[PDB]
Amino acid sequence: DTIKVGVIGTMSGPYALFGQNFKMGIDAWVAEHGNKVGGHTVEFVYRDEVSPNPAQSKALAQELIVKEKVQYIAGLYFTPNAMAVAPLLQEAKVPMVVLNAATSSITEKSPYIVRTSFTMFQNTVPAAKVAKQKGAKKVAIAVSDYGPGIDAETAFKKTFEAEGGSVVEAVRMPLATTDFGPIMQRIKDSGADMIFTFLPAGPPTLGFVKAYIDNGLKAAGVKLMSTGDVVTEPDLPNIGDSGIGILSTYHYAVSHDSPENKAFLALLQKGGAKLGDVTMTSVAAYDGARLIYKMIEATGGKQDPEKAIAAVKDMKWTSPRGPVSIDPTTRHITQSVYLREVEKQDGKLINKEIETFKDQPDWGLVKQ
């Protein structure tokens, strides 16, 4: 028969690159692995999340369940959208494979969730370790005022303070923030020698970074540490060469040097993508498709979400990003977190991986 997978992501609008990357990654998977599992054809259908507006995503999921009769849902760029869809899953008998939404507690909301992206704690704990290693003494934290921003702030404060550092300012910026001039002035005023930031990848991150540079903070010796959300590859040319030297921690770089990543890049191209448009949501989607294929294999194409999740919840494999596994205690992907620096390579700006922190779990859940 035919098994439908409903993919919710930001397919148009300000965040269009990120949902289009879900499709790019799925298309790469299918270019290499085909559209069959045994005798079942797998069909992906796409729905437009647009913005962090949970009414839209909840209505999309309900339509996918009721009218499309999907067996699996995947995607969810924004934490609040994933949170709104999660309670539907067990009674619909449909698992959700989360391909971005990074708040730690998401996986706790339903037994039928597995996440192939990352969490904020996962990437931020290394960021706070590196901040110390790089000599930071006084840090200003600026994060978007919603789930993943709050996680990032909490993770950074705890870790950095334990290493003896000082957090001299901590600001939660409403997501509606477009004018970053005033926050840069507050940061200047704080005396911080380094900023730690998270905003969702997209216009907010481009706006923040451009204001940090153009208001002179970077040239005044205020360093930037971020998660990799803040320096996604397709925006590096828009940041431009003034971005050189920005530090970020993240689980994936397009520049990752492994045979599996080289293969993945070729498949992205084969499936029709431009390398210059690739970023992290494509690798989450590629590995998400792997897990959906495994779930269909394990269930024989039957709608049996308990059996499906059981087949992936402690799987280990090699991703384009590095070695990975699912931690059964959280249903989240354990993975390396890399330190990177924005640099030119072969005349192109990249996030150059300069240190590896192996086997990072979801630090937001595993110590609680």
UniProtKB/TrEMBL annotation:
Organism the protein comes from: Rhodopseudomonas palustris (strain ATCC BAA-98 / CGA009)
Family assignment from sequence similarity: Belongs to the leucine-binding protein family.
Pfam entry (one): Peripla_BP_6
InterPro entries: BCAA_transport, Leu-bd, Leu_Ile_Val-bd, Peripla_BP_I
SUPFAM superfamilies for the chain: Periplasmic binding protein-like I
Protein name, as recorded: ABC transporter substrate-binding protein
Leucine-binding protein domain mapped to chain residues: 2-345
Keywords noted in UniProt: Amino-acid transport, Signal, Transport
CDD domains documented for this protein: PBP1_RPA0985_benzoate-like
PANTHER family noted in UniProt: LEUCINE-SPECIFIC-BINDING PROTEIN, PERIPLASMIC BINDING PROTEIN OF ABC TRANSPORTER FOR NATURAL AMINO ACIDS
